[PDB]
Paper text:
Cyclodipeptide synthases (CDPSs) use aminoacylated tRNA (aa-tRNA) substrates to form peptide bonds between two amino acids yielding a cyclic dipeptide product (CDP). ParaCDPS from Parabacteroides sp. 20_3 (GenBank: EFK64745.1) produces cyclo(His-Phe)8 whilst ParcuCDPS from [name] (GenBank: ETB63777.1) can synthesise both cyclo(His-Glu) and cyclo(His-Pro)9. ParcuCDPS belongs to the XYP sub-group of the CDPS family, characterised by the presence of 3 residues: X40 where X is a non-conserved residue, Y202, and P203 (numbering respective to AlbC). ParcuCDPS displays a Rossman-fold common throughout the CDPS family.
The active site includes the four conserved residues previously identified: S26, Y167, E171 and Y191. Previous research by us and others has shown that mutations in active site residues seriously reduce product formation in CDPS enzymes. The active site mutants – S26A; S26C; D58A; D58N; Y167A; Y167F; E171A; and [name]—were also generated to confirm the loss of activity upon removing catalytic residues. Further investigation into the changes imposed by these mutants was performed by solving the crystal structures of a select few mutants containing changes to the active site or the pocket residues. The mutant structures were able to be solved using WT as a model and retained an equivalent fold to ParcuCDPS (Supplementary Notes 4 and 7 relating to Supplementary Figs. 13 and 14). Therefore, the disruption of activity is caused exclusively by the change in these few residues which appear important for the enzyme to produce a CDP.
Residue numbers in the entry: 1 to 60, 70 to 230
Amino acid sequence: MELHQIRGCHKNDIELKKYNIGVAISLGNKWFSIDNIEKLVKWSLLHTKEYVIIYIADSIKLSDSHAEEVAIRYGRNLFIKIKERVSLSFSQDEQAKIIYATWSDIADSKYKEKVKYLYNLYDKNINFKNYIENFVKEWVSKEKRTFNNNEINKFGRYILEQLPELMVQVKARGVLFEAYVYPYKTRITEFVGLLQKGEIFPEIKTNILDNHPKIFLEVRE
């Protein structure tokens, strides 16, 4: 595993250890085996400024929040497996650098205001709604299963919940992390790139972005 492509800084800022690094796990994505998560976490500990923040970032009713629901159904059991692998793979010195951020650790009141902005935009702006939905339709068109329009719309809202964490630097239990690692560029990361630059839906940048954009580090074998 090494850095492939970087959006938001130069290669020199990474080998200089300027930033804390988040490991965004897409639970249910076949690449995020425990072995690959361990390799992302290993790489992150070696390149980080200080901390590695592990969190659930995607999931393509016991809670009003899909990301919360995911957290309590599956995110906890995943965190339990990662913890045990880590305590056998790393020294007590390294384990102290790891923060297991739950959805509620990240989605504080400031975060929820951003999400709420997006939800309202999804409901009142039909171009924005239509665009978010097509991300969903693209994904589902590479899966076998079909989905109705009502579920497409629901899946779109799930994206908006995670959007601020990809766009802005947020704190996880009082620890700012400026960059996150992910094994592949996606349509989401290209979308976020445009949002941060105000080249698409510029109202979003005006209302939720703070001139400290999340840095995306593409890291894989």
